[PDB]
Design a binder for this molecule. Structure first.
Ligand SMILES: O=C(O)CCc1ccc2ccccc2n1
Ligand SMILES: [Zn+2]
Ligand SMILES: [Zn+2]
Ligand SMILES: [Zn+2]
Length: 99
């Protein structure tokens, strides 16, 4: 996984309500394999369910998303996982909610 990407600039502040790692997909309602968008904090399902986060990427252009299953961060432009100090706050808030 990459130690930086040129899309980390689009990672936005964490809502003061925090994150709910059990939040369902905003399109289909599935509780399985959701991701949270690190720009707008909408929650959509992964590619193996109904691909709604991929659809969100395409209709918004938002680059980076966080898995509620393992707290990895994927960039859809770089087609890679990324970790950087800029992702620790959001990973830590999700880790606290999850565990
Ligand atoms: O939309 C999702 O399923 C999330 C983005 C994601 C995460 C890991 C990937 C690995 C290989 C190919 C595509 C990936 N996409
Ligand atoms: Zn969905
Ligand atoms: Zn978004
Ligand atoms: Zn990137």
């Amino acid at each position: 996984p990459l130690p930086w990407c040129p899309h980390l600039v689009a990672v936005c502040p964490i809502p003061a309500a925090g994150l709910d790692v059990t939040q369902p997909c905003g399109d289909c309602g599935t509780i399985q394999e959701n991701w949270v968008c690190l720009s707008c904090y909408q929650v959509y399902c992964g590619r193996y369910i109904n691909g709604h986060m991929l659809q969100h990427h395409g209709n918004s252009g938002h680059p980076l998303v966080l898995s509620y299953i393992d707290l990895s961060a994927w960039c859809y432009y770089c087609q890679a996982y990324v970790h950087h100090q800029a992702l620790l706050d959001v990973k830590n808030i999700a880790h606290q909610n999850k565990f």
